[PDB]
Design a protein that fits this description.
Residues 1-237 are annotated as: Interaction with TUBA1A. Zn(2+) 1 binds at residues 44, 46, 61, 65. Belongs to the class V-like SAM-binding methyltransferase superfamily. Histone-lysine methyltransferase family. SET2 subfamily. This protein has 237 residues and is of the alpha+beta class. 14% of the residues lie in helices and 24% in strands. It has one domain (1-237). It is built from four helices and 14 strands. It has a five-stranded mixed beta sheet, with no helix packed on it. It has a four-stranded mixed beta sheet with strand order 3-7-9-8. Strand 8 (151-155) and strand 9 (158-161) form a beta hairpin. The structure holds the ligand Cc1ccc(F)c2cc(C(=O)Nc3cccc(N4CCC(N(C)C)CC4)c3)[nH]c12, S-adenosylmethionine and zinc ion (ZN) (3 copies). S-adenosylmethionine (SAM) binds next to strand 5 and strand 11.
């Protein structure tokens, strides 16, 4: 049914109005970068490309970049400088995606262009919690009878919670037969998580990933992904 584009989320007044008429998802605080609840050199050796090579369509810090090969982003001090193609998280080089209402899963993401395989979609941003804060929030959310949950594992004692604060990545739904994956990238010595396509995604297709997370509580949510190999429930490892 109703869809919306990512720029629609930049106007909180218009958003709150479209929301009241069921044309946009419920309001949340839109953020650019992870926020830590509790607060807590790496140069590559790529050969600076010439003016000539930039013009032909050559890639600066491409598949042989030693930073890229370790899922580390370069900094502003990269030998390719401005031209470095390995600062996707930092430069918000997100894929062209729209937010759409699904039949039974709530809102979702869909490709607005064809997206090649291994294309960066979006960073999963949110409030970064420790294990204690996370468990507190699970209990609070269960008490409030929330339907949608927004936790993503980042690393030991770091769980991203996009329930209150996040970005449009929070709309990506789980599928047992997905077309995207998470990848954890080191950006300024700190880990972030992003969604990347794992195959060619046709324009108009819903973007999905295989959500993996330790099981908590009782009454696990049912999966409506529609795959022949559906596990039937969301989460688990
Ligand atoms: C980032 C993302 C993408 C797609 C998903 F399906 C999910 C699901 C989650 C998620 O946080 N699930 C999550 C985490 C913690 C507790 C729970 N439970 C949800 C249902 C609760 N019962 C009492 C109804 C029991 C606690 C769910 N996070 C997702
Ligand atoms: C991170 S959110 C995704 C965005 C959410 N659909 C919304 O409307 O805000 C995760 C929640 O979406 C729903 N969801 C995601 N994938 C699903 C699936 N395959 N089947 C059923 N519900 C799903 C569940 O309620 C889950 O807790
Ligand atoms: Zn490089
Ligand atoms: Zn670089
Ligand atoms: Zn499923």
């Amino acid at each position: 049914g109703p869809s919306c584009v990512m720029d629609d989320f930049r106007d909180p007044q218009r958003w709150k109005e479209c929301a009241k008429q069921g044309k946009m998802p419920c309001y949340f605080d839109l953020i650019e970068e992870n926020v830590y609840l509790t607060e807590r050199r790496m140069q590559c050796e790529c050969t600076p490309l010439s003016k000539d090579e930039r013009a032909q369509g050559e890639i600066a810090c491409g598949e042989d970049c030693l930073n890229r090969l370790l899922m580390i982003e370069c900094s502003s001090r990269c030998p390719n400088g401005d031209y470095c193609s390995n600062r996707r998280f930092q430069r918000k080089q997100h894929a062209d995606v729209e937010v759409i209402l699904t039949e039974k899963k709530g809102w979702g993401l869909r490709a607005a262009k064809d997206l090649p395989s291994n294309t960066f979609v979006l960073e999963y941003c949110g409030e970064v919690l420790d294990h204690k804060e996370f468990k507190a929030r699970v209990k609070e959310y269960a008490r409030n009878k929330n339907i949608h949950y927004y936790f993503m594992a980042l690393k030991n004692d770091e769980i991203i919670d996009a329930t209150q604060k996040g970005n449009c990545s929070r709309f990506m739904n789980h599928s047992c037969e997905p077309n995207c994956e998470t990848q954890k990238w080191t950006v300024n010595g700190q880990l972030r998580v992003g969604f990347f396509t794992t195959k060619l995604v046709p324009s108009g297709s819903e973007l999905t990933f295989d959500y993996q997370f330790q099981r908590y509580g009782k009454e696990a949510q049912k999966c409506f992904c529609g795959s022949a190999n559906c596990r039937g429930y969301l989460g688990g490892e």
